[PDB]
Amino acid sequence: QVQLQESGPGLVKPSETLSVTCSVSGDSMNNYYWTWIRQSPGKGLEWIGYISDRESATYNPSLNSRVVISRDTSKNQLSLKLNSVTPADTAVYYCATARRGQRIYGVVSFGEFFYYYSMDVWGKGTTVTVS
Amino acid sequence: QVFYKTGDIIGDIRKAYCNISGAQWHKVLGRVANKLKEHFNNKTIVFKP
Amino acid sequence: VRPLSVALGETARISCGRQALGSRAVQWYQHRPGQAPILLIYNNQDRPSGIPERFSGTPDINFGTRATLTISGVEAGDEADYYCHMWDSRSGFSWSFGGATRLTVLG
Numbered sequence A: 001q002v003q004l005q006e007s008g009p010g011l012v013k014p015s016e017t018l019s020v021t022c023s024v025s026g027d028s029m030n031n032y033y034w035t036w037i038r039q040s041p042g043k044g045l046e047w048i049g050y051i052s053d054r055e056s057a058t059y060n061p062s063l064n065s066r067v068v069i070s071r072d073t074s075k076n077q078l079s080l081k082l083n084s085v086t087p088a089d090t091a092v093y094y095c096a097t098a099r100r101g102q103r104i105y106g107v108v109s110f111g112e113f114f115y116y117y118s119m120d121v122w123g124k125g126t127t128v129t130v131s
Numbered sequence B: 001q002v003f004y005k006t007g008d009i010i011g012d013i014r015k016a017y018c019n020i021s022g023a024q025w026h027k028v029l030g031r032v033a034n035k036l037k038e039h040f041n042n043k044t045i046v047f048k049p
Numbered sequence C: 001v002r003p004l005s006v007a008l009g010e011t012a013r014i015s016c017g018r019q020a021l022g023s024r025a026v027q028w029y030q031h032r033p034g035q036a037p038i039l040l041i042y043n044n045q046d047r048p049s050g051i052p053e054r055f056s057g058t059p060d061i062n063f064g065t066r067a068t069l070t071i072s073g074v075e076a077g078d079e080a081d082y083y084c085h086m087w088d089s090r091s092g093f094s095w096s097f098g099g100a101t102r103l104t105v106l107g
């Protein structure tokens, strides 16, 4: 069973590199696509860019590719590096697993499949504020 | 005078297509190839797009 | 964000705020404050493993039908917010979850 524990710095200096990481226990590392969730206070659930098991990371265009993520093979951990942070962006972070599923509504040969992800496991949550 | 134009697609956007069974088409095309061999000196018959 | 009240002891249906532009495969997640949210329905058809049948959704048969989430009465788990995540062909990837819907029960 996955005991999803997130390493929480608690306080991060503004305009500095961040190390916010989630640990995964007793699970295959490349079994599912790896995704992260960050919810600002007084805001709806916001999903930041996910990283594939092929070490290719989708990025939210709003974040301007500030986040850099590289999954650590040894530590079973998803290391997030956030640069030039501000008090606004810092918030609670959630670690999640995404199951890629494709919905086909026509001829696959032409190409009418779109991939939709399902959040099988959700993060416990770690709250980080600027210091 | 009313000019009828295409406004939008309600739903998915899907390419138009025509489906032809491969087995029946290739059977008939083999028959056509033999009949063309009869009139074309038993040469190998090559259909190309 | 405007929460919708739910009748006490009666199952209630919430309609997804955003509208699909094509064939849709919605994702439903029930957020839990201070804990890990639990996914409710995937592909709007079948419940995930370990999830009760209390949550069900409309099929995508035909067009002109809106996806909905079913809940069982009112409880502590039902009180917390849940989200509707629309996946339609035309829009593409759905980066934003969307507006939140919350259950409120009192008296």
Ligand SMILES: *[C@@H]1O[C@H](CO)[C@@H](O[C@@H]2O[C@H](CO)[C@@H](O[C@@H]3O[C@H](CO)[C@@H](O[C@@H]4O[C@H](CO)[C@@H](O)[C@H](O)[C@H]4NC(C)=O)[C@H](O)[C@H]3NC(C)=O)[C@H](O)[C@H]2NC(C)=O)[C@H](O)[C@H]1NC(C)=O
Pocket (backbone or CB within 6 Å): A103, A104, A105, A106, A107, A108, A109, B019, C023, C043, C045, C059, C060, C061, C062
């Ligand atoms: C010509 O030949 C091609 C093959 O070369 C053939 O292509 C097939 O086209 C059909 C549609 O006519 C596709 O079937 C789709 O499959 C999806 C999922 O597999 C199904 O969607 C389910 O049903 C409804 C949606 O309508 C929804 O309530 C339900 O929830 C959906 N399922 C899920 C899990 O969400 C449908 O059966 C259908 N989708 C539609 C109609 O939108 C095949 O996938 C195509 N197969 C290939 C190989 O491309 C085509 O039909 C042929 N055309 C003729 C005229 O003969």
Ligand SMILES: *[C@@H]1O[C@H](CO)[C@@H](O)[C@H](O)[C@H]1NC(C)=O
Pocket (backbone or CB within 6 Å): B007, B008, B009
């Ligand atoms: C075409 O453009 C007009 C105006 O830019 C817009 O109102 C209309 O919805 C568009 N149609 C499609 C199919 O995009």
Ligand SMILES: *[C@@H]1O[C@H](CO)[C@@H](O)[C@H](O)[C@H]1NC(C)=O
Pocket (backbone or CB within 6 Å): B019, B020, B021
């Ligand atoms: C075309 O349609 C007919 C009847 O609708 C069916 O019997 C036949 O198999 C179809 N052919 C293909 C290639 O789908």
